[PDB]
Design a protein around this ligand. Structure first.
Ligand code: AXF
Length: 375
């Protein structure tokens, strides 16, 4: 019955992907950012310059106040608000209604984005990272407890809408085989990267560096985020591979945008990135290959030019690796919570290079994969 959930997501990589939800009685429609990097369900509940609508607890006969405050900080942005519960549904999702925890956002900083078209956030990760603590049951945990929806969902993010298949896997959204990596620990969607190659060359780092201090899969982060040491090695390699042309050093900080005459972007000088993930059997891994069309995010020209302009969508991190939306675009990603694993497959909405293709390939042999987890 998944065809009704195909294309139930709108939005871009740099704006976030959102799903339509309704809260309260009578139902109040709101667009909600889908975020696998957090675990709080929160909605704007007070006027804001960037909100065209928000949650009005007073108009809902089913609202219940929890009389407890909440604060949530992200890598960027933060909000605080009031906890409560209400009835929630997903119009283009499963045919159910659940009583879910809702954080009514009363104050925020650098959270809402002007003209993003979404008014809240749906944290899909586990209770361990929920605020104020792990006793606030996350939305997906509530959905699984109160209905018959199986304990998994999948995301097909398509770059320059998408699909969130709640409760299953839709085989028409991907080609080839699904490759699975264990969820190391149920807090973030944490995985273990066992090897990195750029244009087929091993970065030759201690694999602990790749997961320092963690590696997570996060639909709510735009960029691929890398730890300092890995980021510097990656940038050095990508620079050398594209030294044919000259770029401002602010481009490599994701600040300044580079432009090229319409239809002349020199894709071939930018390398592919292969991330190897721990597999399901002993000494086995598999790889996902990232094209430059993924980490060069297209942006609007700052002028009146008909040129193709891009921002560098790989940035430095101090909180571990983040496989953000630009990596997830072009793959079908299965968050198989029931079997504690995350699956990857080439998405049916993949970007077309001319000689190269994004891929998910295996099996590969990798010794001592366990040593790659940071402790
Ligand atoms: C309570 C602990 C859980 C906290 N989890 C995290 O902080 C995650 C690592 C990151 C989150 O997935 C977090 C959720 S989105 C919050 C709004 C940001 C404004 S910008 C945001 C939305 C528009 C497109 N860019 C996005 C982005 O790129 N966000 C990164 C910057 C980020 O921060 N994402």
């Amino acid at each position: 019955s998944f065809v009704e959930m195909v294309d139930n997501l709108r939005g871009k990589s740099g704006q976030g992907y959102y799903v339509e939800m309704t809260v309260g009685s009578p139902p109040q429609t709101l667009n909600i950012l889908v975020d696998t990097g957090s675990s709080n369900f929160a909605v704007g509940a007070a006027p804001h310059p960037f909100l065209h609508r928000y949650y009005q607890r007073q108009l809902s006969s089913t609202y219940r106040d929890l009389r407890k405050g909440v604060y949530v900080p992200y890598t960027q942005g933060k909000w605080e608000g009031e906890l409560g519960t209400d009835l929630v549904s997903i119009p283009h999702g499963p045919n159910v209604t659940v009583r879910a925890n809702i954080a009514a956002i009363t104050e925020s900083d650098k959270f809402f984005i002007n003209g993003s078209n979404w008014e809240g956030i749906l944290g899909l990760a586990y209770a361990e990272i929920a605020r104020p603590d792990d006793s606030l049951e996350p939305f997906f945990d509530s959905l699984v407890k109160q209905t018959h929806v199986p304990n998994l969902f999948s995301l097909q993010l398509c770059g320059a809408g998408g699909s969130m298949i709640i409760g299953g896997i839709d085989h028409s959204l991907y080609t080839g085989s699904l490759w699975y990596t264990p969820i190391r620990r149920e807090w973030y969607y944490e995985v273990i990267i066992v090897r990195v190659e750029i244009n087929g060359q091993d970065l030759k780092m201690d694999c602990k560096e790749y997961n320092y201090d963690k590696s997570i899969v996060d639909s709510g982060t735009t960029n691929l985020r890398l730890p300092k040491k890995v980021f510097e090695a990656a940038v050095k390699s990508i620079k050398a591979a594209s030294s044919t042309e000259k770029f401002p050093d602010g481009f490599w900080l994701g600040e300044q945008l580079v432009c090229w005459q319409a239809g002349t972007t020199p894709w071939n000088i930018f390398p592919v990135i292969s991330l190897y993930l721990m597999g399901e059997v002993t000494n086995q891994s598999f790889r996902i290959t990232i094209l430059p069309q993924q980490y060069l995010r297209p942006v609007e020209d700052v002028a009146t030019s008909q040129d193709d302009c891009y921002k560098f969508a790989i940035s430095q991190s101090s909180t571990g690796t983040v496989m953000g939306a630009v990596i997830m675009e072009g793959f079908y990603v299965v968050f198989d919570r029931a079997r504690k694993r995350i699956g990857f497959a080439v998405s049916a909405c993949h970007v077309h290079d001319e000689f190269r293709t994004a891929a998910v390939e295996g099996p590969f042999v990798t010794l001592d994969m366990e040593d790659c987890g940071y402790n």
